[PDB]
Amino acid sequence: LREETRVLQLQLTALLQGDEKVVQAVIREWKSEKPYLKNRTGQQALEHLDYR
Amino acid sequence: MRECISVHVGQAGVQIGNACWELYCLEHGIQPDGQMPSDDSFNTFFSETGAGKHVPRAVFVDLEPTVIDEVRTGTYRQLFHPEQLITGKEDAANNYARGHYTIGKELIDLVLDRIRKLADQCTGLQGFLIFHSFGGGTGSGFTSLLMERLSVDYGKKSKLEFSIYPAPQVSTAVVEPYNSILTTHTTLEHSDCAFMVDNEAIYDICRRNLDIERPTYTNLNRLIGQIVSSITASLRFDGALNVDLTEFQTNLVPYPRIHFPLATYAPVISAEKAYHEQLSVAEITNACFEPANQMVKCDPRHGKYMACCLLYRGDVVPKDVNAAIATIKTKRTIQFVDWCPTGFKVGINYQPPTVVPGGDLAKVQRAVCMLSNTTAIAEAWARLDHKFDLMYAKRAFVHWYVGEGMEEGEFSEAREDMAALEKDYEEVGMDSV
Amino acid sequence: AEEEEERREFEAGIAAEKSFQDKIQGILSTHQVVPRNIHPMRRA
Amino acid sequence: NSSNYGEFLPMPQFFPCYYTPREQVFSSHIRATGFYQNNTLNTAPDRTRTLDFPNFQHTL
Amino acid sequence: MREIVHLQAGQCGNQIGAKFWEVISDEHGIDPTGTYHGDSDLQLERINVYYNEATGGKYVPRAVLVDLEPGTMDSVRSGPFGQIFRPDNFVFGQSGAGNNWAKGHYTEGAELVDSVLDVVRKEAESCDCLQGFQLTHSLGGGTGSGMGTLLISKIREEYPDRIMNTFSVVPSPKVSDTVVEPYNATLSVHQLVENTDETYCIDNEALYDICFRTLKLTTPTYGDLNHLVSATMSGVTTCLRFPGQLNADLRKLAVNMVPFPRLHFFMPGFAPLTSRGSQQYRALTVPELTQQMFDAKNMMAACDPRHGRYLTVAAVFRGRMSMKEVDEQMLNVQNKNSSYFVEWIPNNVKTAVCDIPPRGLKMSATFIGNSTAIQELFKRISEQFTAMFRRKAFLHWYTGEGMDEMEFTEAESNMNDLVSEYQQYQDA
Amino acid sequence: MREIVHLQAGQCGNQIGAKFWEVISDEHGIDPTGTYHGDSDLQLERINVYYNEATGGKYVPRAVLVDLEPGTMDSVRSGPFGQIFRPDNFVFGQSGAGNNWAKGHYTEGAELVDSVLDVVRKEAESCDCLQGFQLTHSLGGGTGSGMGTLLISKIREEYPDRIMNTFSVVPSPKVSDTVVEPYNATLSVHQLVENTDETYCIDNEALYDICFRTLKLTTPTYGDLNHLVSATMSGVTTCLRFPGQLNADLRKLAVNMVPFPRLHFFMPGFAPLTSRGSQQYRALTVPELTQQMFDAKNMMAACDPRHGRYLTVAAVFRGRMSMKEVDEQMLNVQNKNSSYFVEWIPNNVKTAVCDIPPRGLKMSATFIGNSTAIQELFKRISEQFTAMFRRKAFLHWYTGEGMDEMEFTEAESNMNDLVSEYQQYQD
Numbered sequence A: 001l002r003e004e005t006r007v008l009q010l011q012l013t014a015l016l017q018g019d020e021k022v023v024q025a026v027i028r029e030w031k032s033e034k035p036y037l038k039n040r041t042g043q044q045a046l047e048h049l050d051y052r
Numbered sequence B: 001m002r003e004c005i006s007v008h009v010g011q012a013g014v015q016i017g018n019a020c021w022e023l024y025c026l027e028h029g030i031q032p033d034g035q036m037p038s039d040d041s042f043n044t045f046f047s048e049t050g051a052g053k054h055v056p057r058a059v060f061v062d063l064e065p066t067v068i069d070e071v072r073t074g075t076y077r078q079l080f081h082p083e084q085l086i087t088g089k090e091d092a093a094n095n096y097a098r099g100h101y102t103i104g105k106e107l108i109d110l111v112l113d114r115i116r117k118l119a120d121q122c123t124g125l126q127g128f129l130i131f132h133s134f135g136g137g138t139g140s141g142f143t144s145l146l147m148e149r150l151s152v153d154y155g156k157k158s159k160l161e162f163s164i165y166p167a168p169q170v171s172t173a174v175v176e177p178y179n180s181i182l183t184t185h186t187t188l189e190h191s192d193c194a195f196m197v198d199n200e201a202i203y204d205i206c207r208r209n210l211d212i213e214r215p216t217y218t219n220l221n222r223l224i225g226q227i228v229s230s231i232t233a234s235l236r237f238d239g240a241l242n243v244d245l246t247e248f249q250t251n252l253v254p255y256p257r258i259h260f261p262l263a264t265y266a267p268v269i270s271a272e273k274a275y276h277e278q279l280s281v282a283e284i285t286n287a288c289f290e291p292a293n294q295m296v297k298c299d300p301r302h303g304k305y306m307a308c309c310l311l312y313r314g315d316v317v318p319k320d321v322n323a324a325i326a327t328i329k330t331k332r333t334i335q336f337v338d339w340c341p342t343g344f345k346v347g348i349n350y351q352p353p354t355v356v357p358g359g360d361l362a363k364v365q366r367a368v369c370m371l372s373n374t375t376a377i378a379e380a381w382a383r384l385d386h387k388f389d390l391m392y393a394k395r396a397f398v399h400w401y402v403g404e405g406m407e408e409g410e411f412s413e414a415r416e417d418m419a420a421l422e423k424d425y426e427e428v429g430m431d432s433v
Numbered sequence C: 001a002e003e004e005e006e007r008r009e010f011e012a013g014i015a016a017e018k019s020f021q022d023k024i025q026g027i028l029s030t031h032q033v034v035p036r037n038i039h040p041m042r043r044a
Numbered sequence D: 001n002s003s004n005y006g007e008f009l010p011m012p013q014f015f016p017c018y019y020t021p022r023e024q025v026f027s028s029h030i031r032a033t034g035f036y037q038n039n040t041l042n043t044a045p046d047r048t049r050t051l052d053f054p055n056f057q058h059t060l
Numbered sequence E: 001m002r003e004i005v006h007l008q009a010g011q012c013g014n015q016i017g018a019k020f021w022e023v024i025s026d027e028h029g030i031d032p033t034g035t036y037h038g039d040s041d042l043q044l045e046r047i048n049v050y051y052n053e054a055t056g057g058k059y060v061p062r063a064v065l066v067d068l069e070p071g072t073m074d075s076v077r078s079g080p081f082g083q084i085f086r087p088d089n090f091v092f093g094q095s096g097a098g099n100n101w102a103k104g105h106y107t108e109g110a111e112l113v114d115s116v117l118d119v120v121r122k123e124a125e126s127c128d129c130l131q132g133f134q135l136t137h138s139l140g141g142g143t144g145s146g147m148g149t150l151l152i153s154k155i156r157e158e159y160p161d162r163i164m165n166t167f168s169v170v171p172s173p174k175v176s177d178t179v180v181e182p183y184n185a186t187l188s189v190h191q192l193v194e195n196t197d198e199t200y201c202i203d204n205e206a207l208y209d210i211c212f213r214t215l216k217l218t219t220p221t222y223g224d225l226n227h228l229v230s231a232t233m234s235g236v237t238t239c240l241r242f243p244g245q246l247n248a249d250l251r252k253l254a255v256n257m258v259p260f261p262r263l264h265f266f267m268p269g270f271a272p273l274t275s276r277g278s279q280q281y282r283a284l285t286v287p288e289l290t291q292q293m294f295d296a297k298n299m300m301a302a303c304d305p306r307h308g309r310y311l312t313v314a315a316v317f318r319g320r321m322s323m324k325e326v327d328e329q330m331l332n333v334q335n336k337n338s339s340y341f342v343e344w345i346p347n348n349v350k351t352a353v354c355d356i357p358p359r360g361l362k363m364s365a366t367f368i369g370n371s372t373a374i375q376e377l378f379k380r381i382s383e384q385f386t387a388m389f390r391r392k393a394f395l396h397w398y399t400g401e402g403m404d405e406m407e408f409t410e411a412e413s414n415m416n417d418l419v420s421e422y423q424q425y426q427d428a
Numbered sequence F: 001m002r003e004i005v006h007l008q009a010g011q012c013g014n015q016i017g018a019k020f021w022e023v024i025s026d027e028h029g030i031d032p033t034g035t036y037h038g039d040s041d042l043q044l045e046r047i048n049v050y051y052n053e054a055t056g057g058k059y060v061p062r063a064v065l066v067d068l069e070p071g072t073m074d075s076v077r078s079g080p081f082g083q084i085f086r087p088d089n090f091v092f093g094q095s096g097a098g099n100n101w102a103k104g105h106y107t108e109g110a111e112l113v114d115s116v117l118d119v120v121r122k123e124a125e126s127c128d129c130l131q132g133f134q135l136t137h138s139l140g141g142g143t144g145s146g147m148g149t150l151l152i153s154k155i156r157e158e159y160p161d162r163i164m165n166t167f168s169v170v171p172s173p174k175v176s177d178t179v180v181e182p183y184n185a186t187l188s189v190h191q192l193v194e195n196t197d198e199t200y201c202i203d204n205e206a207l208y209d210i211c212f213r214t215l216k217l218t219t220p221t222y223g224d225l226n227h228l229v230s231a232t233m234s235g236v237t238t239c240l241r242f243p244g245q246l247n248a249d250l251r252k253l254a255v256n257m258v259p260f261p262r263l264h265f266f267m268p269g270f271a272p273l274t275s276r277g278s279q280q281y282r283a284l285t286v287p288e289l290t291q292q293m294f295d296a297k298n299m300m301a302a303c304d305p306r307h308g309r310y311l312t313v314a315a316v317f318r319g320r321m322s323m324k325e326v327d328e329q330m331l332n333v334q335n336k337n338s339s340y341f342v343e344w345i346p347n348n349v350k351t352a353v354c355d356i357p358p359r360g361l362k363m364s365a366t367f368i369g370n371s372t373a374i375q376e377l378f379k380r381i382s383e384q385f386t387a388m389f390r391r392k393a394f395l396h397w398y399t400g401e402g403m404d405e406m407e408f409t410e411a412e413s414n415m416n417d418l419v420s421e422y423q424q425y426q427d
């Protein structure tokens, strides 16, 4: 029970930072974007990226 | 529109905050109930409601209902939100395992519930500002869980603690070396900066600098009140050169594990003695590196300074401080480390300090707050590590800690953790050619 | 004409300096302070 | 010994004389509005180098 | 008609910048409301060099102001000037730059790049012609050195042909303010040498030195340390603004000033700064007395000419003078001691003049110097950085902000390249 | 001369319109009572386009105040300037239209429409030659959407050639007031595309978004929402109303605006919406209008054009304009960024310079340009509809008042036709 709790707590942490997860899928692969895209949210992205 | 959240935990922490919060109300002109006697300087430690009521941004938590009651029913009754001013259920009773496992556990959920309800009202938050101890159970074990939960719930917020270290020569608690070793696993990588205020500074500064004999804790806490007001005033009062909180962190701290500075409030002088001399910028800077004025019982001549941060208040001209720094750098006795040739800051605030009624401090044209990072605090643990292993060698006072659920092996894990931290100050004190 | 122009320019700086120093005795004697820079418990 | 904290009410001669506060009334307005963004389109006259508009008269 | 737009980044950049707009508004007859209240028509006929024309009478100065702490923006707006400034032009962040180059150039200052490059763009299409750029900043913190160098890069691709000027406040060991100042400045000037055309270096030590030794005042705070010292040099652009006899604008002065396209670091100076007591003790003409500025008691940088050679010298003059005695003093200052001058450049000095002096002085001069002794100001901060890089003193606040170990080595090597060239043309 | 009758519908249209009849009154110098105290006769020349002429020095608006809810009409009757409005022109029902299109179009809506038709027929018969009608509502609300589309369908049957200028608030994409905004909007879009000849796509989100940063007001209430929509439809009719260098009317705009007669959904915009703490520094001249007109923020449809090519552009300029400087900028905007401009039309920019200055302002215009990006709303409301249609969500209280499943599919299919028509005419 104690072991599956961390499995079912770290599965909640990453899946609740999903807004961050979508943005981090842009800070990888298409790199040289990270300085002016990292500290943002999902709505700041796709609107910042509109500007570019 | 920038603000600093404070949390005060422990009997030591709550009463040094009563001296902190009496000074905050008397700095900004706020009555002991909340309303202004009749700016944006309130919005660092104070939230403005529909009326003139300024609810304080602190949350006071302790497991003893006795010490929380006299501020619940004192002259600051109407100031504090009565659900912010949270009590406990039973005393932690000088036991790390009690404050970490069995009785401090039923208060984490309610404390973190109030930190969330306070941080969302926040809009430009800079970081936390912790207040605890090292001796008792709730000053050491209950704050350990706080650093455990705030590191994962917040993360990138820069937390600062004004710890009160166990004194090397006098002491008030028997098992407080046990409490001051196990807390070090959670003040190393779960604390961004950690100020140490030992009970040997105002032990004798209140005797030699101030002509008053026989000081008590309501005079101990005022000097701890003055320094925190001096640090945050750069966030709070305008200046010729301001030092933000994040400004202050990356500059004073060398290394991720070396964030344990000393402290010094230089113009601590009595009213009947202050008119006997002029208090210049050069004089008050020369009087702050003296080994009889630091906040921790450690001789700075043994160590070498890494980087020093100076915050000046009130009437200070930024040429005399540059003359003061150059004059105090050329003396051989105060020796710095080779890999940091500059090793200095200045910080200017226009507003001079206030003095509380009944205080023994005299108000000044200029006040300097010297915050030094030394490797002379390496031997701050030397008289505590020898204090530790002598008691630990024959399993003295161990049955209570293992009787409350704490494993035996976590004593030696904190033992080797501080031994490695002592090795770091031996590594950085060696010159490289 | 250039001699009198330099003659009139130097005494203009003499006239500027006494007006510069008479401006001193105004702020030095009266010494206004804005209520925004006073403590809330000092105002009455 | 904790009742002495808020015990003595202040004199008019305790607090500092220069209450120089921070006066963020303008930046609070500027943060509320979004900072200027060029989601706008070309409106540029053809800015040229030397000579603005040639007459080319009396010859050519 | 011929426009340059000002750039202001940093607390030091804003304070010097705000004081700069006080001096030119005093000179051009512009009040702290925008309207004209001066005397001569020779003041408004070139209001289109620094100022933009508002609805009626008012002249709004074009100057982007940026910082990460909004307290400095509150100070410039609630200041002895400020209503002339444009609130839409005021742009800032939420949290400070933390005195860290990496956080002020990569992770926190990069969110404002779109907004700060916008207000440059909207102040670039309103120009009949863009003569150049102009920035006031510093090399101490991330607001001025971090975002400032990020402003240097982002403008350079969009306007490559146009020149661009920076007013840098370089660190000094005698006036130490930040322990990270040797990290910040040695990595900033990597981006002040690749994509700039001419830059000026104004350290605080010589600012304190000339304000004590010459001006004869007791407490030099920063306000009066810029009005009669630092903002007077910024009026070198009077050739763009005032009629002169033969004049050198920011393009003309700089093109025959820098010898090689990556060696442009200059020493500023202002000639008449006598005292408030000894002004009626000497003559405001140009003898060998007030024109031989070889003694560095009237110099805005620490390193003196005695330890190097002058590559190229410029001097813009103000007032009703004739251009022989300024020309024969050039004969008299080069031939009296030619051992301190570059041999293969036979004419090392430039003279420009304007007919309208600043008010209060009937004759004024501003001096700019390219010296091979400026490496002494760069070699000293090299050892401030290598000793602090050998033990990695404050490195990990750079490592976690998206920048690796290698950019420190490139910045150290490029300055070590720069100090080697100033040494290579030392004697030749 | 030419005349316009306003057929304000629902909450939304009356709040817009009563404040529109505010602005027109202030534009004509008309007092809250209605007596003409204006100075320039140019106001009095074409005043009968809006102000039908009553007795006692006083004109009454042609506004047929139409609503079903008992108390929307009490607000505009008790409004500050509400005294001008004719009491017969205050027709109201005795039940609320439940924010449902069905009840506002078949049972509770379609009883007042008989009484509504009687008075609008009277007002048009009183005047001489109509340029075209005006109508304002929201597609989200019940009597805005249902009773709104009851008008235009039953208006055109004896006003065919009059241009139907229904200026509706298509429901805001982000800001969702009513839960069942998708149903009410979809049925209305279905009955505006063949029905109306000219419609302006207006979104409360864009109404918010303009007034956050351009007008600087930190609280865009319902008042300044009504400021903005009033200003874009005083502008499209001012050049008829007031003397002009290049005169353009409602017909003259649309014949120069809609290329194929099902593209009536236009995209409004007003240029000089400067911050009221920043109007001091603007140098308010032609190039900064044309820049601000052609700006993604300053348009009351929440969509950004950019993706959508401008099929056609109007600029109904107000004020004293340099005519060269207007003429140059209109090409210079068009030629320099030709990507969002259709290639099968070489020049799609329409200019309508009108002599009189705007109210208080020096000079203005009205961008009502047709982009194919208007489909972005119609795509959003469509998915918003089919999310709720696929389980027949609020359809249960629709069939009782007189719907069927078929009209729900027909409205969704027509709106798929509308987006596909926009995708097909963009090349």
Ligand SMILES: Nc1nc2c(ncn2[C@@H]2O[C@H](COP(=O)(O)OP(=O)(O)OP(=O)(O)O)[C@@H](O)[C@H]2O)c(=O)[nH]1
Pocket (backbone or CB within 6 Å): B009, B010, B011, B012, B013, B015, B016, B063, B064, B091, B092, B093, B094, B095, B099, B132, B133, B134, B135, B136, B137, B138, B139, B140, B164, B172, B173, B217, B220, B221
């Ligand atoms: N600075 C200061 N120290 C105090 C005060 N009251 C007691 N102390 C001493 O400071 C030491 C540390 O205090 P704590 O660790 O917080 O003790 P505690 O929180 O009461 O212990 P528990 O409640 O059982 O967990 C104690 O040994 C006390 O003797 C005070 O008001 N201010």
Ligand SMILES: Nc1nc2c(ncn2[C@@H]2O[C@H](COP(=O)(O)OP(=O)(O)O)[C@@H](O)[C@H]2O)c(=O)[nH]1
Pocket (backbone or CB within 6 Å): B241, E010, E011, E012, E013, E015, E016, E097, E098, E099, E138, E139, E140, E141, E142, E143, E144, E145, E169, E177, E178, E204, E207, E222, E223, E225, E226
């Ligand atoms: N000469 C001059 N120097 C200044 C002034 N203000 C600040 N400075 C110095 O210039 C340095 C620049 O620091 P800065 O980069 O602006 O710090 P930051 O705002 O946190 O980035 C500071 O260390 C100050 O010591 C000024 O007005 N004049």
Ligand SMILES: Nc1nc2c(ncn2[C@@H]2O[C@H](COP(=O)(O)OP(=O)(O)O)[C@@H](O)[C@H]2O)c(=O)[nH]1
Pocket (backbone or CB within 6 Å): F010, F011, F012, F015, F016, F069, F096, F097, F098, F099, F100, F138, F140, F141, F142, F143, F144, F145, F169, F177, F178, F204, F222, F223, F225, F226
């Ligand atoms: N734009 C605008 N909308 C308004 C105003 N007052 C109420 N509303 C709107 O009215 C809509 C609600 O529809 P409503 O007309 O009340 O429903 P109905 O009366 O049954 O047709 C909401 O979307 C609101 O935006 C106003 O002043 N301006």
Ligand SMILES: [Mg+2]
Pocket (backbone or CB within 6 Å): B011, B064, B091, B092, B093, B094, B136
């Ligand atoms: Mg206790």
Ligand SMILES: [Mg+2]
Pocket (backbone or CB within 6 Å): F246, F247
């Ligand atoms: Mg015509």
